[PDB]
Nucleic acid binder design. Structure first.
Ligand SMILES: [Mg+2]
Ligand SMILES: [Mg+2]
Ligand SMILES: [Mg+2]
Ligand SMILES: [Mg+2]
Ligand SMILES: [Mg+2]
Ligand SMILES: [Mg+2]
Ligand SMILES: [Mg+2]
Ligand SMILES: [Zn+2]
Lengths: 44, 136, 50, 112, 175, 86
RNA sequence: GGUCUUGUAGCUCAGUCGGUAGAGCAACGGUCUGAAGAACCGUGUGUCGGCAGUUCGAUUCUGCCCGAGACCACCA
RNA sequence: UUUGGUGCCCAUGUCGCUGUGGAAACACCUGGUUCCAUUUCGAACCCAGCAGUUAAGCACAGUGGAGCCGAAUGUAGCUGCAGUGAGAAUAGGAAAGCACCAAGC
RNA sequence: CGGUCGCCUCCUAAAAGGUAACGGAGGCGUACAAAGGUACCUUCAGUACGGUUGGAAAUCGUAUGUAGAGUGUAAUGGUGUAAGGGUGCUUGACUGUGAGACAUACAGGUCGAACAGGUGAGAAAUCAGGUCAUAGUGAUCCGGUGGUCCAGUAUGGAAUGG
RNA sequence: UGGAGGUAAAGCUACUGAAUGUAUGAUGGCGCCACCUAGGCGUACUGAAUACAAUUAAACUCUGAAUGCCAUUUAUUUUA
């Protein structure tokens, strides 16, 4: 009854990690440049 | 000149003044006050005259308090006109005074000075006044 | 006065049984109700009649 | 804003006001009440402010789907030869367990 | 999912951290609401349709359009002319959106140095001001004619802010 | 010497409808008779009494009539019809 | 003394019963000219008599005040 | 008698504050697959379940902080100079009460 | 000369009702296929704090807040679980009546139990004969239109009437 | 005996206006600096809101009589 979002995976470009819970899965296993554990506030 | 800034209605009915001084019955701020012994309508002009008299005979030593205030309006049909055809315009405000209301009171100055100041003021008001000292 | 009234009419016996009110200017759609028609002795769809 | 039970109490107050205002006859109401564990019912008669009969899942039953609280209270009422009541949904909605109870009550000679 | 780690460690470690002796005296995050306040649609900026589209794309939760609770003469808004947009999300979508935000969106901001200095309402709630829609991965270069941000909230199951600080810190939120 | 007057502008008033209390306590009444005529429910309906479109109280059955107070600070009023001991 | 009318840009006059201030010249700049006029190009200014209400933003719709204008006022 | 539920009343029935407890119940609470439901959503409603819970609600004790109630006396108004009796202020009271049903007592 | 001529709300109106003046204040000659009927769901305005666009005041979130909010509309009364707000279905904004009362000089005006027919909402109880209530109105006479289990100047029609 | 009622009165932190003194004073007037755009010092003064004490009203009411009114009982009287 809506946009069929699914467990879309992620790809960290620097943290070498991934995230896959649920998102817009039109581009499943998508790449992210700014990694989660890369920002100065998060790490630094 | 004491006067309300603005009101709801411009032509209120007359307010009676034959009672036993609802409110303002006792002195509250000074050690000597002026008390009437016959209720009557006293307008703003007499109020200002008494105020300026007390101020002029007081000096830069004490204070004076005014209790009453001309809230009620009053109408007066113009000159040279038959009656009927509506109600006249408002001309002068007036403070209703029931018999036995403290209305003027001063403090912080010699005792004979209160006596002389209040007696000086009382001769401007139509009502028969009376000197009253603050209770203990 | 304003002539805001209007008359409802049956579509089977074609009587003018009912009368009602309606602002032509706002809703110009002709009323299509279904009330009790005495002559037909049942509930019949009524339409506006000029 | 409320505690998921205060709303139920307010709704029940609304409905009991409705019956107490509309019931020209003296038909005994049938107040069903819904708990997260199980269900219970009492037959409140107005103009007297008493309970004529009552029933509950606490007649040696488990949690509720157990419509026997309809049949037993129907038995009590028909023994008291009333068999005509106004239903009351408490603060709940007429559905599910309440609907099953009401159908069980109706099928055994209640008039509602 | 975040709940995995949440009732894996965080619940009991906060339980032991503060003197509770009650497993669920620990704060629980209740909900997040979404707002953007589309005022440029006085009568027509875009019929808000595109903004509704990205707010639908960010999360399968259907956006709801709000009505003007009053009327303002300064603007062309008078008792209606629906403006704004609200999205309330809970359950698993709540935690999914929370991780997606805190691990993708804010690090992708221009300069996410820190926050949470005083943004609490004072009753255990917090709001983040989002600057632009293009910040989030669930959006294309094409978007509404203008670039608008978001308004999010974090409401806890408590009112005193000490355990609010404790919970937000314990989930690695930037301060 | 006469002068000019006029423009009273305030010489209108409406008919006074006789709203009030048509039935006091201890009165025999038969169904249909109206107890209280008012504008707005200054007197709520109790038991065995009705409320018309015009908010005119009227009994539904035959018996004595009783007034009674209630409400937050004993300010609201019910009027009700008590049956005979038949 | 009463009953109406009007008050808008610098001036003189216009503005769907609600979402709106418009001309001509006056003032500025440039062009022409020995210079000044005249002439040609661009320009510029507008909060609607002052105080109060209805109002979905009142110059606009009503009330009070101010100012002026008008046909008129002691028996006839 | 305790607890739960309900009704009648309407703050002397409130709003708080500090503690005590959950046997049965009462609630949170666990999930949305089923009926049903969200301007959207198991928030609420509705399902089917009791792993944990005294946290909150709930109840019991204390608390007079705010709010509510308020004597007697005197006085204002009346109504033929005696009765009539206010309002305001004050001592003070006040941590609801009344009933039926169900389990344990 | 000016102003007014009917109806509605308040005050004068002296705690039942009624009560005049060229007395004091305001409106009306309506509006609504939903602002009705019904079932269900829900409950203020303002303030404080937090939040980009966005400002004193948009939206949102959390508390406080006994109503200062709302009710198409002048005034009054009433109304916080409502008479206020939303959703689904719908035309009872029905037919024939009407015991009994209200105010009355008359003409007129108002409320209304209850019965029958046939409906709508609701599981049912029940509710629905317009709207929270009070203004939104004009007598006959004359003529015009629709229907018509009526008459038709000797009879059959028709004109013409009821 | 019961009841309806909002007048006399009274009160105004019990609401709508008007309004007195005191205390803290938002705001602004003034001067003031430094700032060309954000603010700071006192502010002869205007004075928000709160607190204490005192007021006023046909069209103000948290309140509030007696008389009067309606009904009823007892007792008496008259055929109105
Ligand atoms: Mg209406
Ligand atoms: Mg309605
Ligand atoms: Mg109407
Ligand atoms: Mg013939
Ligand atoms: Mg013939
Ligand atoms: Mg004919
Ligand atoms: Mg008086
Ligand atoms: Zn027909």
């Amino acid at each position: 009854f809506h946009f069929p979002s699914q467990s879309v995976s992620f790809k960290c470009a620097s943290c070498s990690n991934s995230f896959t819970i649920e998102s817009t899965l039109k581009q499943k296993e998508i790449t992210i440049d700014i990694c989660g554990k890369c920002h100065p506030f998060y790490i630094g | 000149m004491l006067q309300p800034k603005r009101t709801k209605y411009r032509k209120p009915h007359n307010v009676s003044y034959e009672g036993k001084a609802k409110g303002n019955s006792y002195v509250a701020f000074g050690e000597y006050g002026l008390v009437a012994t016959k209720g009557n309508w006293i307008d703003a002009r007499a109020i200002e005259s008494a105020r300026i008299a007390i101020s002029k005979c007081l000096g830069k030593t004490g204070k004076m308090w005014i209790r009453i205030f001309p809230h009620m309006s009053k109408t007066k049909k113009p000159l040279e006109v038959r009656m009927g055809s509506g109600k006249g315009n408002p001309e002068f405000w007036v403070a209703v005074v029931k018999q036995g209301t403290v209305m003027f009171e001063v403090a912080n100055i010699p005792e004979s000075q209160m006596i002389k100041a209040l007696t000086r003021a009382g001769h401007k008001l139509p009502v028969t006044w009376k000197i009253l000292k603050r209770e203990e | 006065a304003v002539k805001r009234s209007t008359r409802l009419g049956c579509n089977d016996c074609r009587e003018i049984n009912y009368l009602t009110f309606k602002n032509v200017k706002k809703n110009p759609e002709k009323l299509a109700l279904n009330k009790f028609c005495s002559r037909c002795r049942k509930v019949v769809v009524h339409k506006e009649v000029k | 804003m409320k505690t998921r039970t205060e709303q139920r109490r307010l709704r029940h107050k609304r409905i009991v006001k409705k019956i107490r205002a509309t019931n020209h006859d003296n038909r005994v109401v049938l107040m069903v009440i819904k708990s997260l564990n199980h269900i219970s019912v009492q037959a409140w008669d107005f103009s007297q402010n008493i309970v004529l009969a009552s029933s509950s899942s606490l007649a040696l039953k488990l949690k509720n789907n157990a419509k026997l609280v309809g049949q037993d209270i129907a038995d009590k009422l028909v023994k008291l030869k009333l068999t005509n009541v106004v239903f009351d949904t408490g603060g709940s909605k007429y559905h599910g367990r309440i609907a099953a109870l009401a159908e069980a009550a109706r099928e055994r000679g209640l008039n509602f | 999912n975040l709940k995995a780690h949440y009732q894996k460690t965080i619940a009991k470690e906060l339980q032991k951290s503060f003197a509770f002796s009650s497993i669920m005296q620990v704060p629980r995050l209740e909900k997040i609401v979404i707002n953007m306040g589309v005022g440029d649609a006085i009568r027509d900026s875009k019929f808000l349709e595109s903004a509704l589209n990205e707010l639908h794309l960010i999360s399968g939760q259907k956006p709801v359009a709000t009505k003007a609770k009053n009327a303002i003469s300064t603007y062309k808004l008078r008792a209606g002319q629906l403006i704004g947009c609200k999205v309330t999300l809970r359950g698993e979508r709540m935690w999914a959106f929370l991780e997606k935000l805190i691990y993708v969106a804010l690090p992708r901001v221009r300069d996410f140095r820190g926050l949470s200095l005083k943004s609490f309402d004072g009753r255990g709630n917090y709001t983040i001001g989002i600057k632009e829609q293009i910040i989030f991965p669930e959006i294309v270069y094409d978007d509404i004619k203008r670039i608008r941000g978001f308004d999010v909230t974090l409401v806890t199951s408590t009112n005193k802010d000490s355990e609010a600080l404790a919970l937000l810190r314990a989930l690695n939120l930037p301060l | 010497s006469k002068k000019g007057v006029g423009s009273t502008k305030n010489g209108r008033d409406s008919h006074a409808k006789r709203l009030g209390a048509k039935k006091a306590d201890g009165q025999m009444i038969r169904t249909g008779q109206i107890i209280y005529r008012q504008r707005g429910t200054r007197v709520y309906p109790g038991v065995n009494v009705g409320l018309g479109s015009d908010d005119t109280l009227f009994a539904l059955s035959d018996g004595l009539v009783k007034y009674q107070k209630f409400g937050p600070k004993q300010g609201k009023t019910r009027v009700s019809v008590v049956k005979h001991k038949l």
